[PDB]
């Protein structure tokens, strides 16, 4: 019997491939960039937060699977009303999200023992990266910026995935430390007070502002130690924010970079 999975979030998609079940995926979202060579060859269903039932359903799924980032809620009710099985998992901002999503997905795909194996492997890489973070004796102050050209310019504080990543890697989230919760508009006051040692951004956000030169035209950013030293870390969003099987690898990368910033 044929199995036709539609996955609604990139991290969920990454888990499906990592569990060795990628051949059954018929549709993915825009954020599904890993493994790049395999996902870019698959039909897109749109933006994970801006979904239509028509988009999902006309791929003729046997199963629709995602996490709490998938929406809107009303589209999700349309899937269930069509009688297509729908499995939505929680995705909390914590280092426990990867293992929880892995087990949920493996169970939803009837391969729970495979999910225990991958979850353990991922756990091990997370633990190994956190140990590498013990190299840092002087935690750098890090500011995460969420950028979309001039339309969106935001900082991330507490109760986010990126906050967890910054801390686990041995950095201080400078925005969080100043009391910012979730995503808030970036102000010159916040940046200047924070004096971040390093600016953390997304690949596509950094391109969208016109590279490093564009980024440093945002008011307040140039007058920070990060701005003066051009100390910018850019990661793709799925890798940094997704909390998927590669979390331990992103942490290793971040902590290596945070150590350089600490020097
Ligand atoms: Mg401060
Ligand atoms: Mg997610």
């Amino acid at each position: 019997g044929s199995e036709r999975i539609v996955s609604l979030n990139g991290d969920i998609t990454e888990i499906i491939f990592a569990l060795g079940m990628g051949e059954y995926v018929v549709g993915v979202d825009s954020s599904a960039t890993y493994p790049p060579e395999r996902t870019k060859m698959l039909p897109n269903i749109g933006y994970q937060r801006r979904l239509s039932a028509e988009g999902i359903l006309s791929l003729n799924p046997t199963l629709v699977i995602g996490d709490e980032a998938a929406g809107p809620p009303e589209t999700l009710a349309q899937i269930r009303a069509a009688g297509v099985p729908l499995a939505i998992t929680a995705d909390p901002p914590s280092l426990d999200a990867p293992q929880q999503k892995i087990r949920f997905v493996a169970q939803a795909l009837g391969i729970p023992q495979r999910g225990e194996r991958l979850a353990a492997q991922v756990e091990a890489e997370i633990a190994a990266a956190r140990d590498l973070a013990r190299r840092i004796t002087n935690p750098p102050h890090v500011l995460f910026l969420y950028l979309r050209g001039t339309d969106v310019q935001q900082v991330a504080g507490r109760n986010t995935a990126v906050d967890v990543m910054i801390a686990a890697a041995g950095g201080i989230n400078a925005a969080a430390d100043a009391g910012i919760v979730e995503f808030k508009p970036l102000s010159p006051e916040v940046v200047i007070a924070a004096q971040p040692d390093v600016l953390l951004v997304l690949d596509k956000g950094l391109e969208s502002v016109g590279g490093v030169d564009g980024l440093l035209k945002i008011p307040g950013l140039a007058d920070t130690p990060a701005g003066r030293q051009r100390r910018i870390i850019a990661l793709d969003d799925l890798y940094l924010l997704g909390m998927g099987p590669r979390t331990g690898q992103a942490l290793t990368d971040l902590t290596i970079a945070f150590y350089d910033a600490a020097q």
Side-chain angles (χ1 to χ4, degrees), residues 7-13 15 48-49 51 64-71 76 86-92 97 101 104-105 241-243:
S7 171
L8 309 173
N9 316 86
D11 57 328
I12 299 302
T13 297
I15 295 162
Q48 70 197 300
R49 285 171 204 96
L51 300 167
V64 182
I65 189 162
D67 63 29
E68 65 184 289
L76 304 186
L86 171 70
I88 300 302
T89 179
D91 197 1
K101 292 180 293 194
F104 174 92
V105 178
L241 312 174
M243 294 288 192

Side-chain angles (χ1 to χ4, degrees), residues 11-125:
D11 57 328
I12 299 302
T13 297
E14 192 176 347
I15 295 162
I16 295 155
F17 279 87
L19 290 165
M21 289 286 271
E23 287 282 300
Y24 306 101
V25 178
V26 292
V28 295
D29 78 306
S30 280
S31 75
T33 52
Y34 195 93
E37 67 269 24
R38 298 280 314 278
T39 58
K40 73 163 138 205
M41 309 282 82
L42 290 170
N44 188 358
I45 66 166
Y47 295 106
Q48 70 197 300
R49 285 171 204 96
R50 309 153 176 237
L51 300 167
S52 72
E54 194 190 316
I56 294 147
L57 292 172
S58 60
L59 287 174
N60 203 12
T62 57
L63 174 70
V64 182
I65 189 162
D67 63 29
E68 65 184 289
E74 293 79 24
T75 292
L76 304 186
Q78 294 271 76
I79 307 303
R80 217 178 299 109
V84 177
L86 171 70
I88 300 302
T89 179
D91 197 1
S94 72
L95 275 198
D96 294 319
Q99 75 202 103
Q100 291 192 53
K101 292 180 293 194
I102 291 154
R103 284 177 159 109
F104 174 92
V105 178
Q107 196 172 311
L109 302 177
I111 44 153
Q113 184 55 232
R114 268 179 200 189
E116 305 306 300
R117 299 200 294 281
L118 179 63
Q121 168 145 26
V122 171
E123 200 81 0
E125 289 173 28

Side-chain angles (χ1 to χ4, degrees), residues 212-247:
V212 183
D213 284 354
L215 175 66
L216 297 183
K217 289 286 164 168
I218 302 175
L221 288 184
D223 317 289
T224 59
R228 294 187 214 104
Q229 289 156 40
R230 289 177 89 85
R231 197 165 282 288
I232 320 294
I233 303 158
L235 295 162
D236 90 275
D237 68 300
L238 184 56
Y239 192 54
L240 179 58
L241 312 174
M243 294 288 192
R246 286 178 306 152
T247 303

